[PDB]
Structure formats: structure tokens, C-alpha cells
Amino acid sequence: MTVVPENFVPGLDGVVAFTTEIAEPDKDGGALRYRGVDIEDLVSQRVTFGDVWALLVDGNFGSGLPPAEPFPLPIHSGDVRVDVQAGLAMLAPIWGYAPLLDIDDATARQQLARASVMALSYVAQSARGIYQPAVPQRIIDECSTVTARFMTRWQGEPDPRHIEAIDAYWVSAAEHGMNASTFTARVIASTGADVAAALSGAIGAMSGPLHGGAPARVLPMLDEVERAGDARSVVKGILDRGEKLMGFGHRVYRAEDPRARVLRAAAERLGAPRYEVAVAVEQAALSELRERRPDRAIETNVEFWAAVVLDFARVPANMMPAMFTCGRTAGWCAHILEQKRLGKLVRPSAIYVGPGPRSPESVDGWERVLTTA
Amino acid sequence: TVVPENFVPGLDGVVAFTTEIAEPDKDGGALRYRGVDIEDLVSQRVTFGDVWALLVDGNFGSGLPPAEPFPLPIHSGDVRVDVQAGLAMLAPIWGYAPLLDIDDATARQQLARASVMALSYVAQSARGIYQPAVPQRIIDECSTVTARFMTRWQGEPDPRHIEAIDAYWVSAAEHGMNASTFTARVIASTGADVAAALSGAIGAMSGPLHGGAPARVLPMLDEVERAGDARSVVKGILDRGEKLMGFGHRVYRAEDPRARVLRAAAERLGAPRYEVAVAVEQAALSELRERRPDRAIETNVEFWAAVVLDFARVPANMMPAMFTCGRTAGWCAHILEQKRLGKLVRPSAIYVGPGPRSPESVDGWERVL
Ligand SMILES: *[Se]c1ccccc1C(=O)Nc1ccccc1
Ligand SMILES: *[Se]c1ccccc1C(=O)Nc1ccccc1
């Protein structure tokens, strides 16, 4: 008889696959820490994304992310995710990226940083589009931070406070543990392949709708409440139609997500025009959902305030998933470097529950098969 | 106080899925596709397209369709990079929706369209940009996708070479759960489009640690052609410290069924390197077992994969792409199985890093704006 482990969980839910020193998503304590440093501390003191990238990868504020070299994007497919996923994979031949097996830690760290900032450059060019002239390097070179250079390359003359919005969002979305995309990067890195191939694979896993973390569409709901005037009526109407309230649902932490609280505070101080309506919608959505089902513990998803912050920086909705990918490159690179030092291939097992030995003549459609008989 | 739950890193020996696709019966020394032995499939010369349908669908009847005309848009100098990048760009132009928004029939059709697209991309990339493309009219004269692949790449393929590739691809179609197959399932579990899953799996196959890629034995095989004594040459390689390529421990009970199948194909098709290769196999096996009478030493399947692939005029740099082409059958079958399972793959990790500390206490804080 074919048996299965007693604590068999399809999808490896709750199974410990690694021990990491990178970050601690303290869901019981309601805090998020990068190498022991709270994200609230990082975002309150206005630490740029390039420095947080160094902190996660290196464990200290050693060497920040360098600027991207001039490299026009070679892929124009109409999908920003596809453009950067394919673009990164082709960096290995032209830049001579060796397999992770054949390089030391210092080479891998430089390669990770070089490609990480190239992914940001590729997204900015793809977002700008092919029907618009490229921004000259001189305007980009006037900027001081990586985040500022990204917006300048994409928008030309971005609002300085919109740059501050992206830094708050990118830091808050830099790393959140062993998600599907981070797991994908570590598995590819565990084969010894080049860092470009590992980053490209993780981009593909992030594209999936079920991955979680991409900003949900809440602008149609926010626009309606601004027009109607009563938030409680709008949320009740959406629920009464059999639809789901976007941006709200089951709790992830024990309470309010620390990333969600950080993003809401950023929208207030930076002067988000939608902040007043968004707060009113949040309290109405919580009150309606916490009363209709008083048993569930329901909090606000971080994707609700991520959309508000990204919309404030004038990011189109179809571009929002790409903004999430750009920030997550810090967490991806940190886990890739840690996996290289770990030095063990990741290969789980599978239990066969299929048919037993059967002759080919016993398979449906065998007569159609052409053979030497 | 921070303690792990009696684990080892890398998920070794941990069951992640149950599968109906294939059973690598290592303790019985047999490999079966949906219960069908690969030895039976090869002995009756079942083509790769039919085996692709058997793995994905569980039955024959609708094999791999011919590839549509599409000149390869990526020329990076690496065949793996070309196909991996090219497959990812199929989604926007072909309207590939995420796996969450399509039914099984749509997913199966999209997998077949991309799977045969990957073979065409590899053939075009191998042929290079310094040569004109083979016209579609000549390709249509062929009857199988394996013959279409050789025609698109070489132009005037030897019929024996086509049979050699067909035998190798069947044995390399699927070998259970591995890093590349695991990667394809993980990406599919997010609901992403099948093109993204295949592109990610190709990157996983690129890694040297994956295993199964054709062994580097040509310099050694060329050597025994000179000396003429297999026994003398192998002993020298061990004596000066190097490792005999293509030989190692046991994988199955005694013999890998794919290795026996591939070797039988070499003699059936009159491979010139066959006589030398068998002599090296016996010389390497006898000396390795004699030096270490405890460890079970058996011929790696990748040793005979190099012999068969080289016979078909496949260069050494192309051999990893050849392995990628054959494995597309297994990846497509597992992606469809993952689609029906509908459970996201999301493991957990334990934090063993530094405790809560202020940013000022971290080294290098003074160099931060
Ligand atoms: Se971009 C740019 C262009 C000219 C002068 C200064 C800048 C700049 O760095 N702006 C900025 C960076 C970071 C945060 C807010 C604003
Ligand atoms: Se390809 C080709 C071109 C012209 C005529 C016949 C073929 C052909 O089918 N060759 C072949 C296919 C499969 C196995 C052996 C040979």
C-alpha cells in the first residue's frame, strides 16, 4: 500500500525549509525588521532604498547600490514584467556572468548589485514607452539617489515628493521572508546558475496573481466614494452585490500590518490627495466587515495603502505590479547570496500514486501511434 | 533557544507532492511513463511527440503539433538564454492569460504551442545568425517533430541521426521531481501563465548542480582512439588525481534503464564511437570497483548521452540545450498537474539573525544620509 507522511501538507505549508539571518517577519509581535532594524525606524529617518539594499544583502550599511550603466532596453513586448524578465536573463552572456559555482562571494555581490539596478533601469524605460524619446543621461546624472534616478529616467521631471513616496514603498516592500518568488530565486541559485538566471525566474513567480502582495484595484472604489459622499453606503452596496471589498480581508499579522501602518503614515505626511477619502473608506470597510461577521479578525491589507501611495506618485495601475518587483529585488539578492554560502541543492521528494505497469497496447489511442509494426 | 524542528536544509527527503505522471522505480531498476516502461517505448520507436502527449494527457491520440513560422528574436550567444528569454515573450503576443483565468483545455493547448516553439528556437539558435534560414517548405517534408527539428537546424539530416535524437529525448522526457521540475511547479502555483513557468524552469536547468546534463567525455573518448588501450588511459587519469568523467555511484539498483537504452541505440545505429565507448565503460567500471570494493559504482546515463548526442553531430556546447528540449515533456505534464492541484507552494523559514537593534548600532551607519 502506498502511504504518505502523517503530517503531509501539499504545497509545503508550515514546513521549515531554511534558517535565515536576513529579516524577521514577526507576525506575533506585529513588527517587521531588516537585520534586526525596524522598518518604521528605516522609513521614519528617511533611509533611501539603495542603502536598505546594502543592509539586507550585507548585514550592515556598508556599500550602497551603484548607479545603472547606460543600457537601452532590448525588449519591447508590451508587458513590463516580460520586458525585465527577459532582459535580465540576457545579461549573463554580454556581461560574462559565470555560474554561481565558479565565482566567489565578492563577485556574486557585485553581479547582484549590477543587475539589480539594471532591472530598475529596464522597468523605467519600459514604463516610459517606445513612442517617447529617451531621457538623456545628464538629467539622470543630476539625481543623487537610485530612487530619484529611476523616476527621472521614467517621468523626465518627476515631483520631488513623488520620489519620497517610492522610497517609503520600496523599503517597506524590500523583503518579507520565504514567499513564492523568494523561494524560486533560492531554488535556482541552489543549482549554481548565474545570478541573472535566478533573478529572472523569481520575476516570473511574482507575476502570478496568487503570489500575494501586488496592489489591489481600489481606485474605482475610492473614486466612487469621492463622488457619492457616503463611504458606508458604498461599501454596503458592493457587499450586497455579492462582490468582495478590495484591499481588505483576513489578518496576516496578529493585528494591523506594520507595512500597512507605515504606508498610511507616509501618505499623510507627504500630502496624498486621496488620503482623506482613503481613511474614511478604511474605517467604513472595517466596520461593515467586522459587524457582518463578528467572528473573523479582519484588518487592512498592505496592498490597500500601497495602491494609494503608488497612485500618489502617478503610477498607472498596470504598472503597479512592476513597482512591487523593483522593491523586492533587495530581498531576492539577499537570499541568493545566503543560498550560495549555504551550498546545498534544493530538491524535495514526490510520492507516486499513478497507475502500475501496463503494456503500451493497454493505453487509450495506442492504435493511432505509428511504430515499427 | 531558537531551535529547528529536526530538519536539514534543502528539503532533502521531504515529500512536497503526489504525482501520477511517472515513477522512477529506483529500487526496481525501471523507469515508467504513466506505467509504461521506457524500454518498451524505445524498442517500438515511439516518437517524441507521442510520448509528450502520453505524459501530459495520460493517453495517446493528440501528439505535439508542428511549430508555426516564427524567426527567433533573441540572439545572445547562449542557446539557453535565447530559448529562456524567447519563451517568456510568447505571452504578450499570443495572449497567454494567467493559469488562474483559463481552463484545463486552454492550458494544455498553450503548453503544446510553447513546447514545440522551444524546439524551433533551439534549432534556430544552434544554426546561428551567420547562415540563412531553412525554408518552411523543406521542413514540411518531414513527418515528425524530431525530424522537423533536425531539418530546421542542419538542413540535410542523416536519417540515423534523427533516430538517435528521438531515442535520447524519450529517455530524457521526465525523471520525477528535480530542481527544474520543482521550479516549474512553484511558478505555476502562483497562477502565472505557462510561458513564465517554462522560462523559469529553463534557468533552473542551467545550473551545473542540477545533474543529468550530458557528460564531458569526448576528450577521454578521443584519447582511447589514439592509445588503443582503454585500461592504460583510465588508470592514468585516476593516478594524477583527476576524476573519470561519466562514472560514479549507483542511482538505480544496479543499472540506469536510460543508460542501457541509450547504449543499445548507439550500436543499433552504427555509432563510430561505440566500440571505443564500450571498452572505456568496462575499463572504468572494473578499476573503480577494484579500487573501492565497497561503494557501488555504475555507469552514469550522461556518459551514453554524450555518445549518442555526439553521433548526431551535436556540439558539446549544444548538449545542455538538447537535454532542455527533451525535458519539456515532463515540465508541461507537471505544470498541468499543478494547475489542477490549485495549492500555492509556500514554505516557511526560521529567523536566526541579529535581534532587535537601533539603526545607529549597525556598523557603517555614519555613512548613511
Ligand atoms: Se532627481 C534631482 C535633480 C536635480 C537636483 C536634485 C535631485 C534630487 O536628488 N531630488 C530628490 C532626491 C531624493 C528625494 C527627493 C528629491
Ligand atoms: Se525529415 C524527411 C525528409 C524527406 C523525406 C523523409 C523525411 C523523414 O521523415 N525522415 C525520418 C523521420 C523520422 C525517422 C527517420 C527518418
Automatic annotation (TrEMBL), chain B:
<dbReference type="InterPro" id="IPR019810">
    <property type="entry name" value="Citrate_synthase_AS"/>
</dbReference>
<dbReference type="InterPro" id="IPR002020">
    <property type="entry name" value="Citrate_synthase"/>
</dbReference>
<dbReference type="GO" id="GO:0006099">
    <property type="term" value="P:tricarboxylic acid cycle"/>
</dbReference>
<protein>
    <recommendedName>
        <fullName>Putative citrate synthase 2</fullName>
        <ecNumber>2.3.3.16</ecNumber>
    </recommendedName>
</protein>
<dbReference type="GO" id="GO:0005975">
    <property type="term" value="P:carbohydrate metabolic process"/>
</dbReference>
<comment type="pathway">
    <text>Carbohydrate metabolism; tricarboxylic acid cycle; isocitrate from oxaloacetate: step 1/2.</text>
</comment>
<dbReference type="GO" id="GO:0036440">
    <property type="term" value="F:citrate synthase activity"/>
</dbReference>
<dbReference type="Pfam" id="PF00285">
    <property type="entry name" value="Citrate_synt"/>
</dbReference>
<dbReference type="InterPro" id="IPR036969">
    <property type="entry name" value="Citrate_synthase_sf"/>
</dbReference>
<dbReference type="InterPro" id="IPR016142">
    <property type="entry name" value="Citrate_synth-like_lrg_a-sub"/>
</dbReference>
<dbReference type="InterPro" id="IPR016143">
    <property type="entry name" value="Citrate_synth-like_sm_a-sub"/>
</dbReference>
<comment type="similarity">
    <text>Belongs to the citrate synthase family.</text>
</comment>
<keyword id="KW-0021">Allosteric enzyme</keyword>
<dbReference type="GO" id="GO:0005829">
    <property type="term" value="C:cytosol"/>
</dbReference>
<keyword id="KW-0808">Transferase</keyword>
<keyword id="KW-0816">Tricarboxylic acid cycle</keyword>
<keyword id="KW-0012">Acyltransferase</keyword>
